[PDB]
Amino acid sequence: VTAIQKVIKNAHVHDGLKIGIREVIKSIESQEAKVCFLSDVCSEPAYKKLITTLCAEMVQNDSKDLGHWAGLFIIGASSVAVVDFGEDSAEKDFLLSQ
């Protein structure tokens, strides 16, 4: 769980985070979103279904936590989509391997 925060920070630093539903969807529909952090605790789980199917063609808990991790200082995030990353080594070699 602590291996995600670093990645998010790196993404923030090097400009490429599609944060919040529609943007995430757009990123997915095209070869840009290289990893998708979504959530479990939602409403309707229709969102979740949409995400999963799109991925198929990480999961994780809660929205507030995601918002905190994302650039909001804190409105509900729902889903994040990372492009570019911006660095290597340390805790990216863990999470990716896992």
Side-chain angles (χ1 to χ4, degrees):
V1 182
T2 56
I4 303 154
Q5 290 192 56
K6 260 194 160 190
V7 172
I8 287 167
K9 286 170 186 177
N10 277 304
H12 279 303
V13 171
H14 275 264
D15 286 30
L17 283 177
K18 278 91 176 197
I19 299 161
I21 28 176
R22 296 162 198 169
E23 290 163 22
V24 169
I25 292 154
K26 286 168 185 178
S27 70
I28 297 156
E29 291 153 11
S30 51
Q31 303 188 338
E32 298 183 341
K34 290 145 189 169
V35 67
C36 285
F37 310 134
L38 61 144
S39 72
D40 276 314
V41 179
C42 317
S43 57
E44 311 186 318
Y47 293 88
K48 295 210 294 182
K49 281 192 174 182
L50 287 167
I51 293 157
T52 53
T53 53
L54 285 161
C55 283
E57 282 180 308
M58 269 268 288
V59 172
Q60 296 158 30
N61 301 344
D62 290 30
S63 56
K64 289 180 179 178
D65 292 319
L66 290 164
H68 266 96
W69 293 166
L72 282 155
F73 286 96
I74 303 145
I75 305 165
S78 80
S79 60
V80 187
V82 191
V83 188
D84 202 283
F85 294 90
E87 247 182 30
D88 282 299
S89 86
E91 284 204 312
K92 302 202 190 184
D93 293 346
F94 273 108
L95 198 166
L96 290 169
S97 72
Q98 290 173 31

